[PDB]
Structure 1
C-alpha cells in the first residue's frame, strides 16, 4: 500500500519461475495459457517450464538468423523480409514453417536455369 517498502533487499523474497528456470520467456504465462487453453484436465509444473524453453530457444534460433540477414543487407533493424530470408534459407526452419506465410516477406531470389540467357549465338537461342 503506497510506494511499498525500503526493500529491494537481497536474500529471501520471491523468485519468479522463469528466473528459477534460467529463462527470459515467461513460465507463469505459459502455464496460464496452458490451463486456459483446454489441453488436459491437468498441467504439471514442469510442462510450462519446458515449453517456455523450447519457445525461447526457437525464437533465439530465428532471431540469430534474421539478425544476420539484416547485417548482410547492411541494416540494423530486422524487418519482415529478414525473417523470411532466415526462414527460407534454413532447411529446418523452412520445413517447420512450410505452410506459413510471412506478410511482407517476399520470396527468395531464384530463377530456373533454363530461363537464363544462352550466351548469344544462334542454334537454339
Structure 2
C-alpha cells in the first residue's frame, strides 16, 4: 500500500485521487501525492502538538476549538499559515 511504503498515516491514494480530480495538471507524478501527504501529516502533527499542549495546560482531557485557536494565535508560524482561515 502506497501510504505504508512511504511510512505515512495520511492516505496517499486519496491525495493522488484529489490531485487528479482537481484539474491541477494533465498528469500527476507518483511522488507528488506522497510528498504532499507527508506535508499534510506533518502540519497536522504540529497543530495537534500545540493544541494538545494547550489542553494539558488547561487541565483538560481533550482538545476543543478554544485550544486550537489558542495554539494558532500563540505560535507565530502557525498564525502566519492559518490565521486567515
Query: Normalising by structure 2, what TM-score?
Result: 0.97
Contact 2:10-2:41 at 8 Å conserved across structures: yes
CA contact (8 A) 2:72 2:79 kept: yes
Runs of 4+ that moved beyond 4 A: none
Deviation at 1:98, TM superposition (A): 2.6
Greater RCO, CA 8 A, separation 6+ = 2
**Unpaired segments ≥5 residues, structure 2:** none
How far does the alpha carbon of each residue in 1:72-116 deviate from its partner, in whole angstroms, 9 at most, with x for none? 1000110000001000010000001131xxxxxxxxxxxxxxxxx
Quote how far apart the aligned CAs of 1:32 are: 0.2
The Cα offsets for residues 18-42 of structure 1, whole Å up to 9 and x where unpaired, read as 0000000000000000000110001
What are the ranges of 5 or more consecutive residues in structure 1 without an aligned counterpart?
1-15, 100-124
Write out aligned runs for 1:99-114 (5 A): 99=84
* Higher relative helix content: 2
After TM superposition, the score normalised by the length of structure 1 is 0.66
Equivalenced residue count is: 85
Q: Distance in 1 between matches of 2:22 and 2:61?
A: 37
- Aligned-residue CA RMSD (Å): 4.4
